[PDB]
């Protein structure tokens, strides 16, 4: 293994310097802290997506996050999760190391694009939610939570295959959080304001939201702010008891909810008109306020809505992930050096 030959061009207003294996680069939109180009890879013969990070080491927080993202992508080997075909830098030494490029298989679109242009049949929804859940079982088994499941974060292709991306990258103390508007719509009530008490089933709430939207074409709870969001949610699931309501509300929001009459539980079969009774039933197990009674990814996969796909011996869990780095405090150049190590130690898929 010697250094490949690289070539340069300008895409999205920077110089992209990539191995000559990647041809026909085409900008196909932003990624998390980066931008993405589609390409053909002469080496595997696949169409791929290449993400170049935007100023990966511009602060300590950014550098760590660059490290976190690389470590996550390297760990994930699962058909319904984005993984790495390649990671490269044009740098020949740590002393010149500035840029990180990540490569995975090309997916044609995201579920935002699909929901906004096309009606989905109950069969589509079955296979799509199944893949989300299959992927999520695997992520959750490595003690990672996605935290931001929404349609734009679910990549799809022409054969209705799906991969989860942008898992576990953001934290709620991050500034200029992009995507925050859409993220609210899909977020579990218990973490809408603080994160002092939650579990991995925050992600299953988001799945419930996405599923409803794939079935109907419409965003289930498109709130304008924390009070509005809560009101929209309670209008469907019903106003809970006083102890639970306190766990999911600010004092202000709680006061707004209580200035209105108690809302009863709606029967989901009278909301989602025309739906598969089994689709309705699973939604009822996903969109529940009590997170200790919300269904897990593993349990959801055995739900009868997924009878045509479910298979316990073909729904794998992950190798154990070392998140000890998360507790560290390092300077830009130290996170950089760690990220460099990870770039250099990468071993590609066999193909």
């Amino acid at each position: 293994q010697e250094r490949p030959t690289f070539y340069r061009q300008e895409l999205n207003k920077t110089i992209w310097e990539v191995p000559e294996r990647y041809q026909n680069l085409s900008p196909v939109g932003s990624g998390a802290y980066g931008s993405v180009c589609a390409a053909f890879d002469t080496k595997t013969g696949h169409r791929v997506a290449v993400k170049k990070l935007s100023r990966p080491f511009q602060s300590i927080i950014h550098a760590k996050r660059t490290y976190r993202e690389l470590r996550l992508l390297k760990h994930m080997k699962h058909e319904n999760v984005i993984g790495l075909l390649d990671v490269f830098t044009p740098a020949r030494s740590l002393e010149e190391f500035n840029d990180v490029y990540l490569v995975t298989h090309l997916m044609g679109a995201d579920l935002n694009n699909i929901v906004k242009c096309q009606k989905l049949t109950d069969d589509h929804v079955q296979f799509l939610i199944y893949q989300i859940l299959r992927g999520l079982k695997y992520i959750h088994s490595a003690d990672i939570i996605h935290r931001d499941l929404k349609p734009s974060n679910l990549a799809v292709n022409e054969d209705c295959e799906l991969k989860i991306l942008d898992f576990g990258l953001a934290r709620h103390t991050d500034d200029e959080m992009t995507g925050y508007v859409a993220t609210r719509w899909y977020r579990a009530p218990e973490i809408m304001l603080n994160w002092m008490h939650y579990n991995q089933t925050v992600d299953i709430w988001s799945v419930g939201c996405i599923m409803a939207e794939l079935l109907t074409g419409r965003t289930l709870f498109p709130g304008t702010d924390h009070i509005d969001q809560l009101k929209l949610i309670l209008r469907l699931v019903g106003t809970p008891g006083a102890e639970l309501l306190k766990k999911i509300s600010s004092e202000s929001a709680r006061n707004y909810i209580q200035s209105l009459a108690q809302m009863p539980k709606m029967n989901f079969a009278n909301v989602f008109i025309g739906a598969n009774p089994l689709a309705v039933d699973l939604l009822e197990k996903m969109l529940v306020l009590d997170s200790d009674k919300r269904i897990t990814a593993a349990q959801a996969l055995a739900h009868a809505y997924f009878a045509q796909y479910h298979d316990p011996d073909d729904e794998p869990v992950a190798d154990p992930y070392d998140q000890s780095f998360e507790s560290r405090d390092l300077l830009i150049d130290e996170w950089k050096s760690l990220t460099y190590d990870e770039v250099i130690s990468f071993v590609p898929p066999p193909l």
Binding site: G108, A109, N113, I114, K116, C117, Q118, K119, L120, T121, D122, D123, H124, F127, V156, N157, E158, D159, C160, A212, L215, T216, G217, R218, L220, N270, V271, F272, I273, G274, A275, N276, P277, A279
Partner: peptide, 18 residues
Amino acid sequence: VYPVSVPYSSTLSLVMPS
């Protein structure tokens, strides 16, 4: 009320936006 796109009646493909 949120009627489904395609009412349920007792290989898959998707079209890309472009």
